[PDB]
Amino acid sequence: SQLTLRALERGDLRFIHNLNNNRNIMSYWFEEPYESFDELEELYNKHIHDNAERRFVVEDAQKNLIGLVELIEINYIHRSAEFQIIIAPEHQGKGFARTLINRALDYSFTILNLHKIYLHVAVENPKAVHLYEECGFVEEGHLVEEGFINGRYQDVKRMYILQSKYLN
Amino acid sequence: NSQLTLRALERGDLRFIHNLNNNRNIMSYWFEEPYESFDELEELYNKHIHDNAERRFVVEDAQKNLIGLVELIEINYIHRSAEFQIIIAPEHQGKGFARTLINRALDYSFTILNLHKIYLHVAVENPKAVHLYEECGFVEEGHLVEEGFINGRYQDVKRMYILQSKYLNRSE
Amino acid sequence: SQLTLRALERGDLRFIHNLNNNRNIMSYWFEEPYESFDELEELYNKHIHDNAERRFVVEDAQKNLIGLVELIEINYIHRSAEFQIIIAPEHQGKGFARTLINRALDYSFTILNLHKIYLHVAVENPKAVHLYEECGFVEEGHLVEEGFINGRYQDVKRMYILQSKYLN
Amino acid sequence: NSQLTLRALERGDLRFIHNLNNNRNIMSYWFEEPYESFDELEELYNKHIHDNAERRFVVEDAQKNLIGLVELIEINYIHRSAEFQIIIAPEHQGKGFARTLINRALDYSFTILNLHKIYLHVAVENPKAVHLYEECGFVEEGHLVEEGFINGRYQDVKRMYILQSKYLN
Amino acid sequence: NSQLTLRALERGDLRFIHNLNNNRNIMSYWFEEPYESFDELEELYNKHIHDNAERRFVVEDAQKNLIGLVELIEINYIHRSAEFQIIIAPEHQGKGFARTLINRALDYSFTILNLHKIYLHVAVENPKAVHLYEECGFVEEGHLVEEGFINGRYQDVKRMYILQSKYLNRSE
Amino acid sequence: NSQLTLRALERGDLRFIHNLNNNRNIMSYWFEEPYESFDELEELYNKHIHDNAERRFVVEDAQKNLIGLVELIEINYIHRSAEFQIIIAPEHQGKGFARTLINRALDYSFTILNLHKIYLHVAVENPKAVHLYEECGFVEEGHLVEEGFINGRYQDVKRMYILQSKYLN
Amino acid sequence: NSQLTLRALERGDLRFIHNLNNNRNIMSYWFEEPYESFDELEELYNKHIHDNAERRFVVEDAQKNLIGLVELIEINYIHRSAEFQIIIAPEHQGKGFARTLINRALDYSFTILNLHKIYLHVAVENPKAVHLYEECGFVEEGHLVEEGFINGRYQDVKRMYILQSKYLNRSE
Amino acid sequence: NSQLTLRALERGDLRFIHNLNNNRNIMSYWFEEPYESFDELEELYNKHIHDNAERRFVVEDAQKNLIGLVELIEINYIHRSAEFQIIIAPEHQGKGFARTLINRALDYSFTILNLHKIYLHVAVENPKAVHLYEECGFVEEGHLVEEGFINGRYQDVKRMYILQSKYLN
Amino acid sequence: NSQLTLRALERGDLRFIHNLNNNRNIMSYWFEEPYESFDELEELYNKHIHDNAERRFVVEDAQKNLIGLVELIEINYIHRSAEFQIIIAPEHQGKGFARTLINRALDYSFTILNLHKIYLHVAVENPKAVHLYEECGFVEEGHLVEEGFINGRYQDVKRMYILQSKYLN
Amino acid sequence: SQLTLRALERGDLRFIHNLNNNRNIMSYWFEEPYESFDELEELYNKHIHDNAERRFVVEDAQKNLIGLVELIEINYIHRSAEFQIIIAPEHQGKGFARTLINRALDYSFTILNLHKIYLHVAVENPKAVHLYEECGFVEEGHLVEEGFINGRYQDVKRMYILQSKYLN
Amino acid sequence: SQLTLRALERGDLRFIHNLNNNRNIMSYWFEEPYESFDELEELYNKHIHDNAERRFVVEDAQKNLIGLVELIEINYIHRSAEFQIIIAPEHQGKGFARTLINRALDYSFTILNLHKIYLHVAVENPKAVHLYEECGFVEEGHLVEEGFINGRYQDVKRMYILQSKYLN
Amino acid sequence: NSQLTLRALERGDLRFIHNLNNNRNIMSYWFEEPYESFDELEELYNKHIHDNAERRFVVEDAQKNLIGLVELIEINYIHRSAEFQIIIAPEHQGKGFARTLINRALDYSFTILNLHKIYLHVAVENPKAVHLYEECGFVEEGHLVEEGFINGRYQDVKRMYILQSKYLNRSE
C-alpha cells in the first residue's frame, strides 16, 4: 500500500540497466536494442516525447527502488497496450507483484481509457501464469517458439484483461 | 493576499509545476502535448519557449514561497479569446488566495492582452469551484456532457465565461 | 445514396479555396490562418501527416464536387472531435446534408471509435439547429460572443452526439 | 464599380506587383525588406508566405483585368492596428474606382480581422489624395515633417486614421 | 497460376495500393503510421524507403496486370519473425490465386530472409480465410478476443503461425 | 550628472532589463516580438544579437550602479530615422538625470550613426514628460488618437521629433 | 538616348553579364568573390540574391536590346557611400549612351538610396574614360600607384568621386 | 576464473581500449574506420553508438580490474554470422583466462543473439593461438595467404570457425 | 571477344543492374546494405556515389548491348585487397566471354588501383565455376563451411585468390 | 625592441573592446558592425577562419597590452592590404608607434609576400601624417568627405608603401 | 591562332569524361577520384567555387573541342600552380600544343600574377620533355617511382618556368 | 634515445604544437589551411579530426616531456606516398634525438601504413638538415628553384625521398 508509482526520469536509467543484468535477454527501448548504459540514455533522449510507451518506477516509503511498470505498444485507436512488470531481485518474493499489477491496471484503465491490456508469460514459468490468472488475466494465446531465450525457441502465453471487468 | 505577486514562469519553476500535476490524477499537457515526467516537461518548455499561444504565470508571496499557477491557453488574437485555468498548491488551497489570483489573471487578460472573452472548464462534480467562479463574475455558457474521462468514468464539465465588457465596466 | 466520401488530396485544395469564397470568415488549416491558395498548399504539405484533423471530399456518381466533411481537434485519449460540414452553393438546397452528416458520423464512430462528436452552429441560423437536432444532436452549450462574424461578436450553439446513441 | 473583386495575393500576381512598383520612384519593401528585381521579390514572397504581419489583396474586375493592390502592413493583433496603402495601376488611375477599393479594404480590416484602427500615410505635396481619404472617413492625426526622402528631398507626410467605431456605425 | 510473378513494390505501384485499401473500410497503416490519402501514402513511402522492418511485394501476371499484394511487417532479425498479410484485388479474388501467393511469400521468407516463424491475423468472422491458411500449413496459436474494432464492434481475431521447420522439411 | 556613462547592452544586463519592464504594466517587445520571462528574453537576445534595426545602451554611474536604459528601435538606414525611448529605474526617477540621458542618446544618434530624424512617443496623460522632451528640443508632430491600449483604455499618444540639423547647430 | 531604361538585373540577364566580362581580360567578381564561368556566376547570384551590399541594373532600349550594365558595390549605409562601375557592350560603346547611364546611376544613388558620395576607379592608361567622368561631375581624389595588376604589369588607377551636394544642387 | 564478468562497453572504458591497441603494431579500426588517437575513437564511438554491426564487451574481475576485451564485428543478421576477436591485457596474458573468455563470448553469440556461425582470424606465425582456439572448439576452414601486412611482411592468416550446433550440443 | 568494353557504372545502368539481380534467388546488397526495388537501389546509389570501398563496371559489346557486370567490393587500400564478383546476363551466359571479363577485371585491379590481392567466393555446388576461375589463375585458399544460406540450405563456399605478383609476371 | 607581436586570441577580445572605448567611431569586425563585447565574440567565432583580415596583439616584456596591429581587406591576387595600428592610451606617447609599424610591414612583406600596404589617416591629424611619412609611406589620395566622424564628414588621406622599397 | 580558351562549364564535363578514356590513369577532380560521369558532375557541383583549380576548354573557330588546359594546386601565398594540358586524340599531332601552352602561361602570369608554374612529365616520353623544354621549361626534379602507371611505378620529371622569364 | 615513445597527437597537445610554429617565422598549415592562432588551430583540429589524409605523432620521453612532432601529410593510398616533416622543440634540438624520430616515422609509414615512398622538403640554405637525411637513407630527387618565399626572398628547396624497398630490405 505504501508503494508509489512515478513516471520514469533520466536518473532512473541506471536502475533500468541494473534490472537488465541477470535477465539474459535482449533489452529494447521503444523497439530498439540496447546493452550499455550509454546506448540507453541516448535513446531515452530521442524517444522522450514518444507516447507509444510509458514507464513508471515503483518505490517504497523510503524511496528504495522496487521495480518497474512499463506499458509498451500503446495504440490509442484500438485502445490496447502490452503490460510488463519487472521486480528487482531484492524484493521479488516479498509479495509486491499483485499490488503493482493493480496499480498498472488502474493507470491504464482509469487515466488512459484503454480497452484491453495484454501480457506475455513464459509457459515454462507456470506459477507466474497462476499469478496473473488470479489477478484477472485469462489466456488468449499459446504462441509456439515465439522467443529465443538462452539458446532455444520457447513458447510464450499471451493473456489479456478487458477494461470492462476491471471497472466492474 | 495583497502581498501576492504574479511572475512570468521561468525554467526554475518547472519543478514547482511538476509537483502540482501529481495528486491531481489527470493527464497533464504542455502546449497541447502530453507529459508526466520532469524531463519530458523541461524538453517541451524549451521547444515552446517562444510560442505565444499560451502563457503561464507563477504566483509567489513576499516570502517568495510558491503559492500556485495561473495559465492562459488556446489564446487566439483574432477572436481575442483564451482558456483560463488556476491551480493552487495543496498547502495554500484553503486560505482564500484564489479570488486574488483570478482577479490578477483577468486584469492581465483584459488590460494588457486586450482580450474580449475568457472561458474556463470546471467539473460538474465540484460545485465548490463552480460557485467560486460565479462569485468572481463567471457565467455558465455550457454543460458539456461526458466531455472528460476522469477517474474511470465519463463526466460532465461546466464551461463558464466572462467578457471584457463586464470586467472593465459594470462598476462604471 | 450515390454520394461517396474520399480522403482529401492535393488536387482538391482548389475546391477548398473556392468553398471559402463567399463565406466571409477567416479560414484555418490545422489551426493556422490562410487566405490564398499558395498559403493553403504549403500548410497542406507541412501538416500532411498530422492526424488531429481528417477531411473528406464528397462527390456524386459523376464525380462533381458536392462539399467537404472535416473532423478537427481529434483527441484520441478522450475520443472526441469537432465536426464541420460545408456544402457547395450549387447543391446547398438539394437535401445532401443529412446523408453527408450520417456518413461523417459513420466514419467517426465505426472506424475511429470516438466517444463524442460536437459541432458549432450560429444561433442566428435556427433552421440549421433544427437540421442537426433532427439528425440526433442535442444542445449542450450556448456560447456568448464566441465568434467575430462580419463586424460583430455572435453567439454560437455547441451541440453533441455520443457514440452510444448512434450505434443503438 | 460594384464589379471589382478582392482576391488574396497569389504567387502568379507577383508580376503585376513588380510592374506597379516601377514608375513609383521609391524604395519598395516586402515585409520590411527592400527589393528591386522580380527574383528578389519571388524569394522573399516564399520566405514570408505565412507571416501574418502583412496582408495584400489583388483587385480585379469582371473581365479579370487587374485594377490595383490593397496592402495592410504593420499589423499588430494586440493593439489591433495596421497601416493601409492603396496602389492603382496607371491604366485605371482616373476612372474613379479608388473610393470603392478603400472601403473594400476597410471592410476586410474592420469586419473580418477585427482591427480597431487603420492609419495611412500621404504626401503633403499631394493634396488631392489627402482630400480623397478625407471624404472616405480618414482624419489627419499627424503632420510628420521630413519623414521621407522623396525625389531628392526630405518631405513632410500626413498620417491619417479611421477607427472601427465610426466605420461600423 | 504459375505465370504469376512477385516483384518488389515500386513507387509506380502505390496507386494500386491505394485502390486496395478502399472498400476494405479499415485503417490503413504504412510502417505503423496511419494514412488514407494517396499523397499521405506517397510521403510515407519516401520516408521509409530504406526501412527494412517491412517489405511489400507486388504480384503481376504475364499480362503485367496487377493481381494483389504481399507484405511482411514487424520483421525482427534477432527472433527471426514477421507478420504476414495478403491482399488480392477484388477482380481476381475468386480465381484461386491466393494459395500461390501465400507459398511464394513463405518461400521468400524462409529461403531468402532465413526467418524462423511467420504469423498472421484473420478475423474470426471470416472462416473462409481461416480455412484457406489451415490448408497452406498455418496452425492457430491464439484467439485474441476483442482485439480489433471493426465496423462499429470489437471483434476477435485468430493468430496463426508456420515455422521454417515445417515448410522446408515435412516432405523430407 | 557628467558621471553617467553609456555602455552597449551586454547579455549580463538582461536581468536589469527584465526588472525594469516589471512595474510598467505594458507588453514588452524585443525586436518586435513579445516576451515576459527572463528566459524568453535571453533566447531572443541570442537570436537578434547582430540585428542592426535596434540598439540599446545601459547607463551606469561612477559607482557602476545601473541608472537606466536608452533604446533606439525601428532604425532605418535609408530614411535615416529611428524611434527613441528612455527608461529610468524607479530608484533614480526623481534625481533629474533624464535630460543628460536624452542628450547622450541624441549625441550617439546624430554624431555616430548619422541619422537625420529621431522620434519618440509619449502618453498624453503624462504632460510632465511632454514638457520634459519639449525642453530638450523635441517638437510635437502628431497627436495619435487611441493609438495604444493602456490600463484598460485606448489612449492617445503624442509623437515628438527632433532633426539632426537643430541638434548639431 | 532618352529611350533607354534601367531595370534591376534578373537571372535571365546573367548570360548578358558573362558575355561582357570576356574580352575585358580582367578578374570578374560577384559580391567580392571571383568567377569566370557562367555556372559559377549563376550559383553566386542565387547565394547573394538578398545581399543589399551591391546592386546591379541592366539598361535596355525601346527595342529591349541589352545596351550595358550599371552596378553599385561596396555600399555602406552608415557612411552612405558606394563604388560605381559602368560597362557598355562593345556594339554600343561609341554611340554616346554612357553619359545617360552615368546620370541615371547617380540619380538612383542620390535620390532613392539617399547616398552621400559615389566613387569610381579608372585606369590611368585610359584618359578617355577619366575625361568622360570629369565631364559628368567627377573630381579626382586619388592617384593610386601600382594598385592593380593588369595585362602583366602593375598599373596606376585614378579614384574619382562626386557628392550628393553637387548633384542635387549646383543648378540651384 | 568464474569471477570474471562481461559488461557492455561504456564510453568510460574507451581509455582501456586505447591502451590495449597500443603495443599491438597494427592499424586499429572502429566500425571499419581507422583511428589512432583517443579523441578519434571517442568521436567515432559517438557516431556508431547505435550501430548493431559490431558489439564489444569489457571483461572485469571481482576487484573490477579490467582483464580484456571481447569484440564481435561484421555481424550479419541474415546469414547469422560474425567475426570474433579476443584481446587480453599484457598484465594477465599468461594467467590462463583466455578459454573462459572465449566461451563466455560464444555463449553470448549463440545463446542470446542466435547466430549460426562465428569465425576468427589467427596469424599462422602464432601456432599457440591456433592450438588454443582448436581446444575451444574452433576448426580451420581456410589458410588465407598474404592476407595481412604485419611487421613489414605480407603474412598468411588462418580462418577458424565454430557453429551454433556444436556449441549447444 | 576483344570487342567488349568496360565502362564505369552510370545511374542509367541501374535498370540493367536490377534486372540482373532478379533470377538470382539471393539477397542483393549495395555497399553492405540490402535492397530489392529499383527505387531502393537508386536512392542508395545516390548516397554512396563517392564511396571508394566498392567499384562496379558495366561491360558492353561493339553494338553497345549490355553483356555483364564486374564489381569489386570490400576494397581496403591499406591491405590492398578486394573481393571480386562477375555476373553475366542470362542472354550471354554460354557464349564463353567470362574469361575475358575476369582478366579485364584483374587488369583494372592490378594495373591501375595497385592492389596486392583479389579474392572471390564460389559455391561448392557449382564446380564448373570453380574450374573456370582455376583456369584464370585463381587458387583455393579456403573451404568455408555453411557460410551462406542459399535455396533454403546452409551451403559451403570456396574462397579463391590471385596475387598481383602472378598476374603481372 | 622588447615588444612582441602575437596572433589575436579569444581572450584578447576584451582588450579590443577597451581599445574601442574613447574612440567614438563605429567598430567593424570583418566588415560587420559591433558595439558590445558579446557581439564581438560571436563574430570572432564566425570569422575565425577568414584570412581576409589578420590581427596581432602587441605586448611588452612583462606582457602588458600595448596595442593592436590589424591588416584588413587582404587580397592575395593583387597582393594588397589595409594597415591600421591602434596604441592604447596608456602607451600612446611613449614612442612605440614606429617600432610597431615596422613590425607590421615586416610580417606583410616578408611572410605574406604582399605588393602594397596602404593606410588611411585623418587630414585633421597632420602629425600622424608626418609619422607615417617618416616611416616610408607616401600620399596617394586625399579622399573628400570619406568618413563621418562625430557629426561631420571628414577628409581622409590614403598613403601607401610598396614591397620594393621596404626590402631595398 | 584561331584557338580560343574558355572557362569550364557544366556541359563540357562530357568532353572531360571522353578525354579520360584511353588514358588508363586514375582521374582526380580537386584531389578526389572519379571514374563515371555522374561522379564527375556531382564533384563539379560541390567544388564549383573552389579557386584552387581552374580549367579552360580549348576550342577552334568552328567550336570543335580540341583539348583542356587545367591549373591545379594553385597557392596564392607562394604564387604557384601545377600546369597540365590534355589534347584530344583527334588533334594530338597537329601542332596545337605549343600555342595552348603559351595561352596557359599567359593566363597564369598576366591575370593571376603567379610566380612559378611547374608541370610533371613522364621520363619514358622524352619527346614531350623536349616540347616543354623548347617552350621555356627547365628540369628541376627527377622524381623516382612517383606514379603507378599501368602495373609499375614510373619516374616523372618535374619542370618549371618562372614569371620573370616569360614576361621578359 | 630508445626511451622516446611515439603517440598519436591529442587535443591536449595542440598547445605544444602552437609553441613550435612560433619562432619558425613561416606560415603554419593544418590540412592545407593556414592558421596562426591557438583558437584557429583548435577549430581546424576538430574539423579534420577524422580526415586520414594527414597524421601527426607527438614524441615524448620516459619523463613524459614533449620532445617534438612527427607529421605525415599529402598521404595518398592509391600511389602509397606521403610527405614527411619533423620538428623538434628548441630545448632538445641538439641532443641527436632526430635520427630516432626519423626512423620511428619511416617504420610506421612502411610497416603499418604500407606506403611505397616517403618524400620531404628541406631548405637549400640548411645543409645541416640535408646532410642529416642523407645519413638516414634519403636521396635527393629534386632541386626546386624559388619554390618558397622565406624571410623576404624566394629560395630553393631540396626534395628527398626514400622507398619502402630500401628501408625494409638493404640489410637483407
Author numbering:
A (entry chain A), C (entry chain A), J (entry chain A), K (entry chain A): 3 to 170
B (entry chain B), E (entry chain B), G (entry chain B), L (entry chain B): 2 to 173
D (entry chain C), F (entry chain C), H (entry chain C), I (entry chain C): 2 to 170
From the article:
The allosteric site is located between monomers that form the hexamers of the dodecamer, and some evidence has been provided that shows when polyamine binds to these sites, the dodecamer tightens.
Our analysis of the spm-bound structure of VcSpeG showed these two regions form potentially significant contacts: π-π interactions between F32 and F149 and an H-bond between R25 and N152. To elucidate whether these residues could be important for stabilizing the interaction between these two regions of VcSpeG, we created three point mutants: N152L, F149A, and F149G (R3C4-R3C6). Our analysis of the spm-bound homology models for the R3C4-R3C6 constructs showed all three retained spm in the allosteric site. On the other hand, when we replaced phenylalanine with alanine (R3C5) and with glycine (R3C6) at position 149, the π-π interactions between F32 and F149 were removed and the H-bond between R25 and N152 side chains remained. While this H-bond is still possible in the R3C6 homology model, it may ultimately be disrupted due to the greater flexibility of a glycine substitution at position 149. The single point mutants we tested in Region 3 (F149, N152; R3C4-R3C6) were insufficient to totally inhibit enzyme activity. In cases where only a single residue in this region was altered (R3C4-R3C6), the disruption to the activity was far less.
